[PDB]
């Protein structure tokens, strides 16, 4: 048996808005610790891993561990039926094929329930070991999204260059080329709209702007984003879901074979 109530349900509503367009079907692993999701896209180029611990939930009970496969698009259609200020409860009995979602309003005068059909799917889950990266950049979410969109107006691939002085996003195309330089904030803003960089080794990598624009769809979850990367390893775009948990996007780079 599994049941979980959350008052700040907008979080969940936002969560699926970041996932429905990139992943179509995923496998939610439910355990006493919380909720986990690891799934690749159809292209196998990017991976998404979401974690939400039980401590962030308002109520959380789960006797047996579950691994329920859901269609993210249908579940996002369900969550579109919930007001931004609604209280959302998820429920599913042991070894069940349906998931019940209950939206209860603040005035507690409209109560809606939905049961979406689950499915047994073939989830290919990779094993990503924990590791430290050579460069980690924290910067405003909106600035990252703006940079990705504007460079998508220029080319189809972005080259990110990280050193100690700052970060640079370059992109070239038939019309020409362009660079966006973000310097580590020295103006002591403390407002959190500042760009801090912690570097072990300078790193230059190349990624597809399409996938990054898909990633920036998780902007309303957090005010800032953390880009972690090292030499010849997938980029990690991380969005911190306040106090509750995180949403990470792994993106495989583009390497040059030297003819």
């Amino acid at each position: 048996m599994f049941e979980a109530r959350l008052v700040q349900g907008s979080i969940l509503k936002k969560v699926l808005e970041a996932l429905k367009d990139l992943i179509n079907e995923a496998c939610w692993d439910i355990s006493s610790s919380g909720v986990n999701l690891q799934s690749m896209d159809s292209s196998h180029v990017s991976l998404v891993q979401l974690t939400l611990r039980s401590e962030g939930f308002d109520t959380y009970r789960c006797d047996r561990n579950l691994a329920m496969g859901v269609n993210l698009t249908s579940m996002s259609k369900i969550l579109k039926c919930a007001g931004n200020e609604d209280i959302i409860t998820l429920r599913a009995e042991d070894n069940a094929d349906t998931l019940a979602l209950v939206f209860e309003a603040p005035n507690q005068e409209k109560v809606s329930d939905y049961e979406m059909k689950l499915m047994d799917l073939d989830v290919e889950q990779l094993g990503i070991p924990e590791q430290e990266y050579s460069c980690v950049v924290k910067m405003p979410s909106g600035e990252f999204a703006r940079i990705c969109r504007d460079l998508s107006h220029i080319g189809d691939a972005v080259v990110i260059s990280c050193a100690k002085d700052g970060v640079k996003f370059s992109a070239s195309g038939e019309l020409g080329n362009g660079n966006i330089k973000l310097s580590q904030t020295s103006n002591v803003d403390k407002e959190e709209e500042a760009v801090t960089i912690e570097m072990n080794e300078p790193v230059q990598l190349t990624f597809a702007l399409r996938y990054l624009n898909f990633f920036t769809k998780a902007t309303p979850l957090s005010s800032t984003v953390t880009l972690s990367m090292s030499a010849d390893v997938p980029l990690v775009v991380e969005y911190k879901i306040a106090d509750m948990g995180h949403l990470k996007y792994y993106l495989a780079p583009k390497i040059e074979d030297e003819e």
Binding site: H44, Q125, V233
Partner: peptide
Amino acid sequence: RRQTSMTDFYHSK
């Protein structure tokens, strides 16, 4: 010149 995949870096345990 080559777009890689997640499978190329990690492994399915």
